């Protein structure tokens, strides 16, 4: 069995915009180079949270039907997003794209940023069960397109717009599930269970910035305002 | 929502 020619087409224009993301060097660089006091440390973390938000809105736009959607819906389904989006992609930049040493410097730098255990425990025990599943670039980034045309977010108008955006990204993972792991049918059923732990960093998000509302170190007025 | 508008309409 293999992706019908409309398969491979929706496949290729997801992995063509997913693959010119890039982490920039500056900021690499800072991970290697600033001090290691909670302010520094921070100050990386909100380099790399300014820099995520970027790189979701170019992905996004070149999503097959995404342009298609009514404005308003489009903005809905980037706020409800972000936070989810932001964690699969931190997940491959720890586990695949930074060096064994450059990681080990960057989790060094979260676990001394300032940010309560409560924040930072199960965000690596994400990253472990992520790299368990030895997830291919195709998985990484449809999961990631998935994520983000979610039709149940709040505030969208027409739904089912969504929906028919959704299922054929959906459809193509599952076919790819059973084409590359044939001796294991539940492995579709493994990467659905990403989708519902992605979803419990939302409100552990949501009650992180609430916390930072009476402190003046951590709150980031950009990042803030939004979610 | 400032933000998300500009970035998505560039
Ligand atoms: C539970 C949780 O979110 N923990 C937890 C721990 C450490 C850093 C973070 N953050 C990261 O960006 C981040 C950075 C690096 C890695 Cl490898 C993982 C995550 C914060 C964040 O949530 N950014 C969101 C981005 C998308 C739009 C809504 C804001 C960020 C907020 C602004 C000030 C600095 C820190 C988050």
């Not at chain 1, 973390?45 to 979701?56: D, F, G, R, Y």
């Not at chain 1, 993972?173 to 792991?181: A, E, G, S, V, Y």
Request: with cysteine; hydrophobic share 40%; glycine share 2%.
């Amino acid at each position: 069995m293999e992706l019908t020619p409309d398969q491979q087409t929706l496949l290729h224009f997801i992995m063509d915009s997913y693959n010119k993301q890039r982490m920039p060097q500056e900021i690499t660089n800072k991970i290697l180079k600033e001090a290691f006091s909670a302010e520094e440390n921070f100050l990386i973390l909100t380099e790399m949270a300014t820099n995520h938000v970027q790189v979701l809105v170019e992905f996004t736009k070149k999503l097959p039907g995404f342009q298609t959607l009514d404005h308003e819906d489009q903005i809905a389904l980037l706020k409800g997003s972000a936070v989810e989006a932001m964690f699969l992609r931190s997940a491959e930049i720890f586990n695949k794209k930074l060096p064994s040493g450059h990681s080990d410097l960057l989790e060094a730098r979260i676990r001394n940023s300032g940010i309560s255990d409560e924040y930072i425990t199960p965000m690596f025990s994400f990253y472990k069960s992520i790299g368990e599943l030895k997830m291919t670039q195709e998985e990484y980034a449809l999961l990631t397109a998935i994520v983000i045309l979610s039709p149940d977010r709040q505030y969208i108008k027409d739904r089912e717009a969504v929906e028919k955006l959704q299922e054929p990204l959906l459809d193509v993972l599952q076919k790819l599930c059973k084409i590359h792991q044939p001796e294991n049918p539940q492995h579709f059923a493994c990467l659905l269970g990403r989708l519902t732990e992605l979803r419990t960093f939302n409100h552990h998000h949501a009650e992180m910035l609430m916390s930072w509302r009476v402190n003046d170190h951590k709150f980031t007025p950009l990042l803030c305002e939004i979610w | 929502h400032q933000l998300l508008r500009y970035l998505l309409d560039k």
